[PDB]
mmCIF file of C-alpha atoms and ligand atoms in Angstrom:
data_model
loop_
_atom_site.group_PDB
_atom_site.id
_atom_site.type_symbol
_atom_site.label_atom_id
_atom_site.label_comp_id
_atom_site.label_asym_id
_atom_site.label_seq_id
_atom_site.Cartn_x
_atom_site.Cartn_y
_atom_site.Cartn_z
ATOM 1 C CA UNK A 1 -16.162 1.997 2.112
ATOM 2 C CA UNK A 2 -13.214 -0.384 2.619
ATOM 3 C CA UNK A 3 -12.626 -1.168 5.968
ATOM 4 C CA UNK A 4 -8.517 -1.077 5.360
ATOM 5 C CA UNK A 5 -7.368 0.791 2.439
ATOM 6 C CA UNK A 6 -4.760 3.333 2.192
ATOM 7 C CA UNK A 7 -4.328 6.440 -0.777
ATOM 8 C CA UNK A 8 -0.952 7.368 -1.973
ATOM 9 C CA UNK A 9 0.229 10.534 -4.013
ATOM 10 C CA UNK A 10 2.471 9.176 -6.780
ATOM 11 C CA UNK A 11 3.081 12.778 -7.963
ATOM 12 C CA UNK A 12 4.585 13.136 -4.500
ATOM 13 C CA UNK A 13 8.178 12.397 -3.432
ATOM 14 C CA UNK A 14 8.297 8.446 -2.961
ATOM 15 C CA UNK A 15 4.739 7.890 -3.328
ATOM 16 C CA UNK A 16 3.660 8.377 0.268
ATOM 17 C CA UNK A 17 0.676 7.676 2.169
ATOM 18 C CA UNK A 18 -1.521 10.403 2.275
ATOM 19 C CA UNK A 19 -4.250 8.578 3.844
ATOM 20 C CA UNK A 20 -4.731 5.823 5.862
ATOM 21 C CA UNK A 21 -8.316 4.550 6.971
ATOM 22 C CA UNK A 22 -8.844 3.391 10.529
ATOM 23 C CA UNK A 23 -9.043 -0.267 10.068
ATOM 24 C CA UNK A 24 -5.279 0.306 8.435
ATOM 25 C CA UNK A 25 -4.582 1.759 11.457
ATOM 26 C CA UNK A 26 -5.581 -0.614 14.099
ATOM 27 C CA UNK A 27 -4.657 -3.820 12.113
ATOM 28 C CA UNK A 28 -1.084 -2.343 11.391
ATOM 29 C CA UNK A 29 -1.150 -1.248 14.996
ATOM 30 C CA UNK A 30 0.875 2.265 13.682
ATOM 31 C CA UNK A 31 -0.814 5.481 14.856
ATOM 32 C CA UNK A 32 -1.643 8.124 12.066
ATOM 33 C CA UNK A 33 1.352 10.105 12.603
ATOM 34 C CA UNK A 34 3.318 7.380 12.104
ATOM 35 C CA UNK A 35 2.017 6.319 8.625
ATOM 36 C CA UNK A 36 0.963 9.719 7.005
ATOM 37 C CA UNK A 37 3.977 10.558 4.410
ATOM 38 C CA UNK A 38 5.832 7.847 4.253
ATOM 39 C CA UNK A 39 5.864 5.018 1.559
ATOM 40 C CA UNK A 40 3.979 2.283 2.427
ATOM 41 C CA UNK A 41 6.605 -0.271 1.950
ATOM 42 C CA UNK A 42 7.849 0.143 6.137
ATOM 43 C CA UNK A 43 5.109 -2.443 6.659
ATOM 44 C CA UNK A 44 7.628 -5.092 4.900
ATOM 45 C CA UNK A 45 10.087 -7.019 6.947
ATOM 46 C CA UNK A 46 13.033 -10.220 6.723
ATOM 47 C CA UNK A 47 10.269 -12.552 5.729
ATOM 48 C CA UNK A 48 8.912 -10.306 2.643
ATOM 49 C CA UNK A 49 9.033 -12.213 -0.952
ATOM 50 C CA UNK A 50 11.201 -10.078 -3.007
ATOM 51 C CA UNK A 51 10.185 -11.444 -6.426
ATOM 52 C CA UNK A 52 6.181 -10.197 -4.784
ATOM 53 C CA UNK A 53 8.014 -6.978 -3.929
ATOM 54 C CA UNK A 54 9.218 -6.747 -7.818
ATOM 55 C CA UNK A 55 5.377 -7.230 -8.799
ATOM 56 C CA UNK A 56 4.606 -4.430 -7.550
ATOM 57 C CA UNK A 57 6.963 -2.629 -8.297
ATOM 58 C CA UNK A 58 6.010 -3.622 -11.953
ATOM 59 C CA UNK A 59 2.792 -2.838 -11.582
ATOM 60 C CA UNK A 60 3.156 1.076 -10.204
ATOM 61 C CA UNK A 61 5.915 1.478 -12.538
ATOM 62 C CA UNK A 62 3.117 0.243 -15.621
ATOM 63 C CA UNK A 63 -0.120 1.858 -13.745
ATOM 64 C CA UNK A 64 -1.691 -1.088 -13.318
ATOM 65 C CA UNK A 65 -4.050 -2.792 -11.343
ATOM 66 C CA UNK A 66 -3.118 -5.823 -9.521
ATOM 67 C CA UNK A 67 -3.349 -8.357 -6.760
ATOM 68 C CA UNK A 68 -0.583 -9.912 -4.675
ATOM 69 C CA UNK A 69 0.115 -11.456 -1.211
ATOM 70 C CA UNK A 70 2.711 -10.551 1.041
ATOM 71 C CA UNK A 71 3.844 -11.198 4.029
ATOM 72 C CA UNK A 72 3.602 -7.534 6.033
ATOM 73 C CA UNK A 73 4.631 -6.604 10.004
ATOM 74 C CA UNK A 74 2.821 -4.808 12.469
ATOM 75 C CA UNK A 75 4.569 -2.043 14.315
ATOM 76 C CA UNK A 76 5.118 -4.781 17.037
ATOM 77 C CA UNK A 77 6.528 -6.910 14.739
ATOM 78 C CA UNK A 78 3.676 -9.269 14.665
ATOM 79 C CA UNK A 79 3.397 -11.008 10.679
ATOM 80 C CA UNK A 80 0.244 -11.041 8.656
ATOM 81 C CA UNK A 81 -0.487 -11.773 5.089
ATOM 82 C CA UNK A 82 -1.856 -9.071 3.348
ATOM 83 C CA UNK A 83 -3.821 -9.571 0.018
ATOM 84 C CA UNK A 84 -3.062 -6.556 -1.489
ATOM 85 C CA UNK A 85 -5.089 -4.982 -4.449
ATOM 86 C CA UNK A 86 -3.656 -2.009 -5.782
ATOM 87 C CA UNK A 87 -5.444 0.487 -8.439
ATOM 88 C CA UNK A 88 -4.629 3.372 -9.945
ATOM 89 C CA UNK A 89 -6.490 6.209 -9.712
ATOM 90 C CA UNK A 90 -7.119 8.578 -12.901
ATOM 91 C CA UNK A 91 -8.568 12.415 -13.729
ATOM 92 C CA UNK A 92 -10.455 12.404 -17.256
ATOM 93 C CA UNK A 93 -7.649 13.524 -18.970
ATOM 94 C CA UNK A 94 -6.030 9.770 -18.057
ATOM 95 C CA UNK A 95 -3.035 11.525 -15.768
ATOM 96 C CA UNK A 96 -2.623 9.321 -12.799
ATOM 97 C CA UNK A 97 -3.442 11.052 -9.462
ATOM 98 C CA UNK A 98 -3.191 8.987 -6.582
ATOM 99 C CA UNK A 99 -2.857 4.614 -6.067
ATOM 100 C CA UNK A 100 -5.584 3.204 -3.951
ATOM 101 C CA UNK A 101 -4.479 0.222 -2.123
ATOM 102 C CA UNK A 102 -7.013 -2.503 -0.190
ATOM 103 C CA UNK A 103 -5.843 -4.891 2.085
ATOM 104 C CA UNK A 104 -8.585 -7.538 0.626
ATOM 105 C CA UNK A 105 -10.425 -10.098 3.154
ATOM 106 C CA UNK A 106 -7.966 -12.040 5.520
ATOM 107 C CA UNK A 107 -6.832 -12.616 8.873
HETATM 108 C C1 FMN B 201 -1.419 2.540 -2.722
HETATM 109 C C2 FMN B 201 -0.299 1.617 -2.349
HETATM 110 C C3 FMN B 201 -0.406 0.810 -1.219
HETATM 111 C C4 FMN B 201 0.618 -0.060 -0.869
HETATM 112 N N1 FMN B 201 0.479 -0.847 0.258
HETATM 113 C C5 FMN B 201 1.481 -1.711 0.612
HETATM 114 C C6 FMN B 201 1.321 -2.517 1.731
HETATM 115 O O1 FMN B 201 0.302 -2.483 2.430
HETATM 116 N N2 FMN B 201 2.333 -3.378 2.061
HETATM 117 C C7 FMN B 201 3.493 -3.439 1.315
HETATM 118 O O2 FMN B 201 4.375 -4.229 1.630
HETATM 119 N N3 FMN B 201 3.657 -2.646 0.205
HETATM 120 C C8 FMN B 201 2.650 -1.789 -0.150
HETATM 121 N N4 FMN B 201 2.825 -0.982 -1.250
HETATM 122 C C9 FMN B 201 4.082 -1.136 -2.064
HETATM 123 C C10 FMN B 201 5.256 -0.240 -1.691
HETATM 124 O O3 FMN B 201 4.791 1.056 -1.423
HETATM 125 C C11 FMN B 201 6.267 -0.208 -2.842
HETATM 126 O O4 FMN B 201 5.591 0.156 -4.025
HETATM 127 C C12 FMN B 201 6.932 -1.568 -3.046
HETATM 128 O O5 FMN B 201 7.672 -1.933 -1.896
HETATM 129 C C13 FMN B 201 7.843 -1.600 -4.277
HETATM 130 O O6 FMN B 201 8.611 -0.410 -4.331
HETATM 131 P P1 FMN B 201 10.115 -0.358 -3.760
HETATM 132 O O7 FMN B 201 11.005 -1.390 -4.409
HETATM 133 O O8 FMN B 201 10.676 1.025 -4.030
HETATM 134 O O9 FMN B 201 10.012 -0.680 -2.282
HETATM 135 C C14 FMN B 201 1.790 -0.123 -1.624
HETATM 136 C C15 FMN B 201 1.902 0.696 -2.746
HETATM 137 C C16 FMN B 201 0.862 1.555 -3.108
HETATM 138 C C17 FMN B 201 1.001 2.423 -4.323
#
């Protein structure tokens, strides 16, 4: 599997993590407590391109998959890019059930 990929519950309030691999963990340098339940935009900071923001924003809002790349912070406040891919997940009855996101490739 992905070595740094998170699962949110969009049928949840706020969409929040409900999983977070360990690669996520280490890279983002946030423990699991620290990530599990919350919406995954915390990793965003002063630097973060709001018009990349409103992409996605577009795209979870139209259950879409897409690809940006934003600028993200570790809990120490170091910056990384993160090449985000985000797909929706679906049962067979085409009802959305979770959003898997990959941070693709990288630094
Ligand atoms: C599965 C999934 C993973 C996401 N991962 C990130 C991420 O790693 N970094 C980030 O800045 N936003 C990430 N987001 C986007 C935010 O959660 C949020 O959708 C975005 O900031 C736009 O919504 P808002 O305007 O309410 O903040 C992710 C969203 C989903 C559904």
């Amino acid at each position: 599997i992905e070595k740094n990929f998170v699962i949110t519950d969009p049928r949840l309030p706020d969409n929040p993590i409900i999983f977070a691999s360990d690669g996520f963990l280490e890279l983002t340098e946030y423990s699991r407590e620290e990530i599990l339940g919350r919406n995954a935009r915390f990793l965003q900071g002063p630097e973060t391109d709001q018009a990349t923001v409103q992409k996605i924003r577009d795209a979870i809002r139209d259950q879409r998959e897409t690809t940006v790349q934003l600028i993200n912070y570790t809990k120490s406040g170091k910056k990384f890019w993160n090449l985000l891919h985000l797909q929706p997940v679906r049962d067979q009855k085409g009802e959305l059930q979770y959003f898997i996101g990959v941070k693709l490739n990288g630094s």
